[PDB]
Each structure stands twice: as structure tokens, then as C-alpha cells.
Design a protein around this ligand. Structure first.
Ligand SMILES: CN(C)c1ccc(C(=O)NCCCCCCC(=O)NO)cc1
Ligand SMILES: CN(C)c1ccc(C(=O)NCCCCCCC(=O)NO)cc1
Ligand SMILES: [K+]
Ligand SMILES: [K+]
Ligand SMILES: [Zn+2]
Length: 399
């Protein structure tokens, strides 16, 4: 079945941040308005037997001192008195300031994404679900001891760690479709050949987070050399050109790596209508949405997959895209046609889809060849280092 993470408390916590507000509610309510909920298997977020069990789970990646600081930041934001100078210095030491501030539910909010993504990994491992979606997860920037880019705990790293460690040779392919470089996940697995990371994103001078591009092109280290793939793209790319840029890379990675699991971060900030206004992707499903092209391709591999959210700052448009991704996932996994009306159905949040109330977003739609040659050579180097056997000509021809 296709699983999806949701629950009453989970929705309350996912809607508690100052940056993302009620985005998760709009997404889940639009999926519910389109009558998709009965086609999906609810995956409950993971809850623990004790504070010690929760710390053991989160500290599989994060440091205890960072988790302690994040918990303290929540406690302090639950009192009226301002922080002491010492507490401000402590929070600054973990980058819990500026664009990653505290708020009354910061720890419960961050931990909820981890609870959802670990449960989603568990549902794949026990084979209850072929695919699991978590629109409350996908926080790719958080590091071992540092908050970054509105990400406090890295639910993706923790979910991948659960997938990789599920066997007593498991390989995971991580694909990051967000407008931003998936730096936190790439860094977490920089030295591991068992987790291959691939991020497609915009990169340009001063654009966050500044990595995933020429620096030379770094691609992992130690036994993880050649295991971190990146495709930086110039501003203004449309659905067709982004699809042609990533299509052969995705197919080649699947052929060579033969992953046991795929984890996809589907941040919606590439949409033409996102306030970043950098890429020109759509949610159109007749050009065809780059996101839908990539998801349909990944699902065609028939490998257990986790689909996560991420960025997306135009809330109704992110809900429009993720509702289409959810319906496509049902169609591809089950072979059950999911007919979605081009008109938004009446529901609680209907007014947020005005003035047109349509499902399609309101939009009228050599560098890459060099990247393809570079990525092909890196994949050959990865395969050689890891003693994997593949047909070079079968892979060369995809490009
Ligand atoms: C000292 N000070 C006041 C600041 C310093 C740095 C920033 C910043 O880089 N902001 C950029 C953060 C953007 C994160 C992008 C998140 C995303 O969608 N990832 O996928 C801001 C303020
Ligand atoms: C683990 N994972 C991601 C999957 C597992 C099983 C299937 C499958 O067999 N699906 C059967 C139906 C295929 C739908 C496509 C048919 C079509 O497009 N007809 O026009 C798919 C994915
Ligand atoms: K990305
Ligand atoms: K790696
Ligand atoms: Zn982003």
C-alpha cells in the first residue's frame, strides 16, 4: 500500500512553527478534500517508551549537547523572562538564532518530523507499505550540532540511518529535489558508500547554503569517495529542461547502485510561483511537472521509497503540488486511476485557493552536457571503488 504520515497531535505540532504556519494543514486537507485519504494507509508517528529511548534515537545523528540545547530553548520560550547572556551564547554556539529562532514548541515541532520519518522508515522495513509519504518531514539542512535553514533536527538522516541499519548489503539512494542543496544529508553520509546522495538545486554566489557546486567538485571522502552527487542549475529552468537534466542521472544511479530503498526530498520551492522566484517548475499533469516526471520515474523502479516534503513558501501552491504527487503515487504503486478535478473541491481551506480555485498553479510557461559527462565519470569511479558491475554502454546511452 501507499502510506502517509498524519495524526491529530502530529498536525498540531507540524503547524506550530512561525515559518511554516499552517502549511501542513492545507496540504493534508487538500488531499482529504480530493478523497485520497481512504486510498492511503495512515502511518502513525513514532512515540517512545522513555526520554532515554527518545535521546538514543535522536543522538544516532545529533549530539546530546545539541539536543539538550534545543530542549532548553523550548523551555525558555515557554517562560515570559528573556534569555540570560549565557543562555544567548549557548544558543549561538548551536546556531539557534536569527533564521532558526526559538519558539514555544521548537523542540516538539522538530521532533515531530523525526517521529514521522522514523515511523515511515519502519513501515517500509516491515513491508507494510511499498511507499510512505511524510509531508511534515524533509528537513535537509540540520547538522549534528547545528540548526540551519529553518531545520532543527534532521529527520532525513535519522530515517536513512534506520533504513541502512535494518539488515544484520543495504544501499540507500537519496534524491533531493528542493531548490536548495541538501547539505546536511550529504555531509552526514560523506564517508559512507552505502548511502549515495544526489541533490539537484540552484547554486549561485551568495545563494544559500553555498555548497553543491564547484569549490574543484568534491564528491565524498574516504570509503565514501564519489558517493555524493550534485547538479547545480542556473536560474529560470523550466519543467522540460529540468526533467531532461535529471532524468538520465536518476536512471543511471538506479542501474549502477541497485538501491534497497530510495528516499526523496520533494521541497516545493522550485515552483514558478514560490516567492524565491528562481526555477519555473509547475504541478501540471497533462508540459509535465518536473516533480511529477521525477517521482513517476523513481516509482517505476519498484524499490521501497520514502517521499518527504521540505521547502515551499507558497502554501496553497505547495498543497497543489503535493496533492498531485500523492495522487500520482497511488496511481503508480496500485495501478488504480486517481482522477483529480481541475477545480479545487470545497473544504475548510477553500478560500486560500482564490481567486481562480483551480488545481494547476497560476503560471503560463552546454553547461548541462558538461555536468552529465562529469556525473557519468563519477558514477564509473563510484562503481569501480565499490566493485559494482554494470554495463557502461547501457549507462552512457541514457545520456
Ligand atoms: C546574521 N543574520 C541576521 C543572518 C545571517 C544569515 C542569514 C541567511 O543566510 N538566511 C538564509 C536562509 C535561507 C534558508 C533556505 C531554506 C530552504 O528552503 N531549504 O531548502 C540570515 C540572517
Ligand atoms: C516499491 N514500489 C515503489 C512499487 C511496488 C510495486 C509496484 C507495482 O507493481 N505497480 C503496478 C501498477 C503499475 C502502474 C503503471 C501503469 C500505467 O501507467 N498504465 O498506463 C509499483 C511500485
Ligand atoms: K535539492
Ligand atoms: K555518501
Ligand atoms: Zn529549499
Amino acid at each position: 500500500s501507499v502510506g502517509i504520515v498524519y495524526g491529530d497531535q502530529y498536525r498540531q505540532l507540524c503547524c506550530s512553527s512561525p515559518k511554516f504556519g499552517d502549511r501542513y494543514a492545507l496540504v493534508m486537507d487538500l488531499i482529504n478534500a480530493y478523497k485520497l485519504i481512504p486510498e492511503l494507509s495512515r502511518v502513525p508517528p513514532l512515540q517512545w517508551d522513555s526520554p532515554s529511548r527518545m535521546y538514543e534515537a535522536v543522538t544516532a545523528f545529533h549530539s546530546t549537547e545539541y539536543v539538550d540545547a534545543l530542549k532548553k530553548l523550548q523551555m525558555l520560550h515557554c517562560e515570559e523572562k528573556e534569555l540570560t547572556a549565557d543562555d544567548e551564547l549557548l544558543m549561538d554556539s548551536f546556531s539557534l538564532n536569527y533564521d532558526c529562532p526559538g519558539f514555544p514548541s521548537v523542540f516538539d515541532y522538530s521532533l515531530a518530523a523525526v517521529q514521522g520519518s522514523l515511523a515511515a522508515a519502519s513501515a517500509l522495513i516491515c513491508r507494510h507499505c511499498e511507499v510512505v509519504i511524510n509531508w511534515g518531514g524533509g528537513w535537509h539542512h540540520a547538522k549534528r550540532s547545528e540548526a540551519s535553514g529553518f531545520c532543527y533536527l534532521n529527520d532525513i538522516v535519522l530515517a536513512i540511518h534506520r533504513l541502512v541499519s535494518s539488515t544484520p548489503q543495504t544501499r540507500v539512494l537519496y534524491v533531493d529535489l528542493d531548490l536548495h542543496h541538501g547539505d546536511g544529508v550529504e555531509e552526514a553520509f560523506w564517508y559512507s558508500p552505502r548511502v549515495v546522495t544526489f541533490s539537484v538545486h540552484h547554486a549561485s554566489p551568495g545563494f544559500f547554503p553555498g555548497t553543491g557546486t564547484w569549490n574543484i567538485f568534491l564528491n565524498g571522502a574516504g570509503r565514501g569517495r564519489f558517493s555524493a552527487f550534485n547538479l547545480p542549475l542556473e536560474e529560470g529552468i523550466n519543467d522540460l529542461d529540468w526533467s531532461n537534466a535529471i532524468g538520465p542521472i536518476l536512471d543511471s544511479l538506479n542501474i549502477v547502485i541497485q538501491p534497497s530503498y530510495v528516499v526523496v526530498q520533494c521541497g516545493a520551492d522550485c515552483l514558478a510561483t514560490d516567492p524565491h522566484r528562481i526555477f519555473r517548475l509547475t504541478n501540471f499533469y497533462p508540459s509535465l511537472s518536473g516533480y511529477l516526471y521525477a517521482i513517476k520515474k523513481i516509482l517505476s523502479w519498484k524499490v521501497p521509497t520514502l517521499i518527504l516534503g521540505g521547502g515551499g513558501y507558497n502554501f496553497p501552491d505547495t498543497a497543489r503540488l503535493w496533492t498531485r504527487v500523492t495522487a500520482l503515487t497511488i496511481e503508480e504503486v496500485k495501478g488504480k486511476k486517481m482522477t483529480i478535478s481541475p477545480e479545487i473541491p470545497e473544504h475548510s481551506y477553500f478560500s486560500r485557493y482564490g481567486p481562480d480555485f483551480e488545481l494547476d498553479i497560476d503560471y503560463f510557461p552546454d553547461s548541462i552536457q558538461k555536468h552529465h559527462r562529469r556525473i557519468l565519470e563519477q558514477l564509473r569511479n563510484y562503481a569501480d571503488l565499490n566493485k559494482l558491475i554494470y554495463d557502461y554502454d547501457q549507462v552512457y546511452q541514457l545520456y
